[PDB]
């Protein structure tokens, strides 16, 4: 409430939620964080990294789909292509190149 | 003995002696 757009406070609060194994709380928190600051790639990168660490590959894919809806820089597109290339899935990477 | 001293004092000497001369709880109530 005092610091709404502070990325460091968001990162530390998501991390503090995650280190106590509150997964659903932290996923709600990451949704709030990427809603408030959609142009901070640090929050998106943490969000895809967390939902790749916990298995959950379609969830990581839909988070990447939201990120690609926001039209990010080339690094996020390359990260999405690397995600889909890692687990086979080359044709969907072809639509990502499109 | 008014001859010059072999170790002449400098300002950084004064700085060197300037620098050097500067739980468990039994119960839940005190917790």
């Amino acid at each position: 409430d005092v610091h709404p757009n502070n990325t460091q406070l968001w990162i530390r609060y998501i991390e503090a939620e995650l280190k106590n194994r509150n997964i659903n709380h932290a996923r709600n928190l990451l949704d709030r964080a990427v809603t408030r600051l959609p142009r901070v790639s640090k929050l998106w990168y943490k969000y895809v990294y967390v939902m790749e660490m916990l298995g959950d590959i379609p969830g990581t894919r839909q988070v990447f789909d939201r990120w690609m809806k926001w039209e990010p820089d080339e690094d996020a597109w390359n990260a999405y292509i690397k995600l889909e290339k890692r687990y086979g899935e080359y044709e969907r990477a072809r639509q990502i190149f499109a | 003995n008014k001859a010059p001293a072999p170790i002449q004092i400098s300002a950084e000497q004064l700085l060197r002696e300037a620098v050097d001369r500067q739980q468990r709880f039994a119960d839940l109530e005190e917790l």
Binding site: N20, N22, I23, N24, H25 | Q23, R24, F25, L31
Partner: peptide
């Protein structure tokens, strides 16, 4: 997770918190 945090709050022991 709310219930689990309530359980962890109700069973906290300040014995192993002294060591880092």
């Amino acid at each position: 997770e709310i219930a689990r945090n309530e359980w962890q709050r109700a069973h906290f022991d300040p014995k192993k918190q002294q060591v880092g």
